[PDB]
Structure 1
Amino acid sequence: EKDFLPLYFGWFLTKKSSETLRKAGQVFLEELGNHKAFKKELRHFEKLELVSYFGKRPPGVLHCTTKFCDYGKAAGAEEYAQQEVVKRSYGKAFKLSISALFVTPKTAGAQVVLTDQELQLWPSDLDKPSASEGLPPGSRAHVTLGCAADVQPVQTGLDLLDILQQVKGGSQGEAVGELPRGKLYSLGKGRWMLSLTKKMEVKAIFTGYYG
């Protein structure tokens, strides 16, 4: 008999923070979908309700996933789960810093900027890691807000990596506009980023989800 691991580890936002971020995300999607610059790109295909477009949303509490384990069937699962830092941090409260919200034609999410301590909990063996894309470790860290109907797991992280590639190289450009919470950037190809004037800090508990 082998101990059967979680579906995935991550930081699970407290009820309060989760609700707070969920609303922020919804307002962002509502505001963005109504923004002149977005509609203009959109009509470059009327008005699209982004909340409906990104219809597959996390049903339970929002979270920032570290290692997907699939109960042990995922590669590197047992190795990740038996890490000292993971055991020590299990059930521990953290604050996750959210610096931006983004959308693409596939996903809507929040960019997480992990601390070095929290970075110790970040998987060392992701299938498509930041390092493979010239970005610092843990840059893929995120809270998914919503996904298009046929968008599979993990896409949100990949999408963030791609967006962070656009800002790194400089493709950020001038803000095309501004929403109450910050400056809005068009990265082209349906990619949009709201750079928060004030970083959002969410309380979350690091633990394992079993489904």
Structure 2
Amino acid sequence: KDFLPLYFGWFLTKKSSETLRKAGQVFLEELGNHKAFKKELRHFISEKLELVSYFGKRPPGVLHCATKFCDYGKAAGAEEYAQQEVVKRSYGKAFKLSISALFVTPKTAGAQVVLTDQELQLWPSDSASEGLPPGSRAHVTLGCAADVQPVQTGLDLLDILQQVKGEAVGELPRGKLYSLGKGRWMLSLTKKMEVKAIFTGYYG
């Protein structure tokens, strides 16, 4: 047949990618320098940690929010995903993604995406997902620790939302900082950030 992409997703514009990337960097700088984070460094790893370097594996270019990992058809449900009318119809079209929070764990750094009803139509329907609304996994990856694979980022977000399912420990310029234990951190943005993106397929 025609082989599918490596994955489908929304790919941020240059502009939006810059803006979100910087926001992520600033968050990492602020968080690592924050008194509340320094107290819990023993629950984060095994003197201050520079989190921008810790998350050394970062997206090189434009950022994205993946929908369905297809691995060129080899992944289960890949064909069944690509054949959908709403996918074929939305291919190449513009969307705005809403960023609700930035998060950090011992494994990944990322941004939480809250999909619109329309965008959720593009979310795949193939135990981490249990109990949470559809599309909760939706994220943009900002960084990964050396031996992590950024499939981890989605799992990390889901685990975090399973927790949030109390009171702020800190105040950052962009919002409230929450300490969720086990080295997990969440910045809830006072103002949700809007990024512009195009739905398409990555081949690489």
Same fold (TM over 0.5): yes
Does the CA-based 8 Å contact 2:100-2:113 persist in structure 1?
yes
Aligned to 1:70: 71
Q: Secondary structure at the match of 1:59?
A: coil
Assess if the C-alpha contact under 8 Å between 2:144 and 2:150 holds in 1.
no
1:131 aligns with 128
Q: Percent identity?
A: 100
- Find the aligned partners of 1:51 and 1:93 in 2 and give their Cα distance: 31
8 A Cα contact 2:129 2:158, kept in partner: no
TM-fit CA distance, 1:44: 6.1
Deviations 1:141-162 (Å, cap 9, x if unpaired)? Answer: 0000001111123111110111
Decide which moves more: 109-118 or 146-155: 146-155
SS in 2 for 1:38: helix
Task: Give 3-state SS (helix, strand or coil) of 1:200's partner.
Answer: strand
Change (3 A) 1:85 1:44: closer
- Distance, in Å, in 1 between the alignment partners of 2:111 and 2:9 is 15
Q: Residues 41 and 84 of structure 1: is their aligned pair in 2 closer, same or farther, counting only changes over 3 Å?
A: same
Whole-Å Cα distance in 1 between the matches of residues 71 and 43 of structure 2? Answer: 41
SS at match of 1:132: coil
Alpha-carbon distance, 1:58 to partner: 1.1
SS in 2 for 1:43: helix
Within 1, Cα distance between the matches of 2:189 and 2:158? 18
2:139 aligned with 1:146: no
Measure, in 2, the Cα distance between the counterparts of 1:86 and 1:80.
8
- In 2: Cα distance, 1:53 partner to 1:132 partner: 28
Q: CA deviation at 1:60?
A: 2.1
Q: Displacement, 1:73?
A: 0.9
Structure 2: unaligned runs, 5 residues or longer = none
Quote the Cα distance in structure 1 between the aligned partners of 2:87 and 2:162.
29
Deviation at 1:42, TM superposition (A): 1.0
List structure 1 segments (4+ residues) > 4 angstroms apart after TM superposition: none
The answer to whether 1:162 aligns with 2:155 is: no
Q: How many residues were matched structurally?
A: 201
Corresponding residue SS for 1:74: coil
1:134 positional shift: 0.7
Q: Give the alignment's TM-score, normalised by structure 2.
A: 0.96
| Cα deviation 1:12-32 (Å, max 9, x = unaligned) | 000000000000000000000
Deviation at 1:40, TM superposition (A): 1.0
Tell me how large the CA RMSD over aligned residues is.
Answer: 1.2
SS for the counterpart of 2:39 is: helix
Deviation at 1:59, TM superposition (A): 1.4
Q: 1:131–1:137: 8 Å Cα contact kept in structure 2?
A: no
1:43 offset after TM fit, Å? Answer: 5.1
Q: Is the 8 A contact 1:175 1:186 kept in 2?
A: yes
- State the 1:132 CA deviation: 4.2
Structure 1 residues 73 and 97, CA, compared in 2 at 3 Å: closer, same or farther?
A: same
Q: Distance in 1 between matches of 2:129 and 2:137?
A: 11
Task: List alignment gaps of at least 5 residues for structure 1.
Answer: 125-129
TM norm structure 1:
0.92
Distance 1:153 1:191 in 2: 16
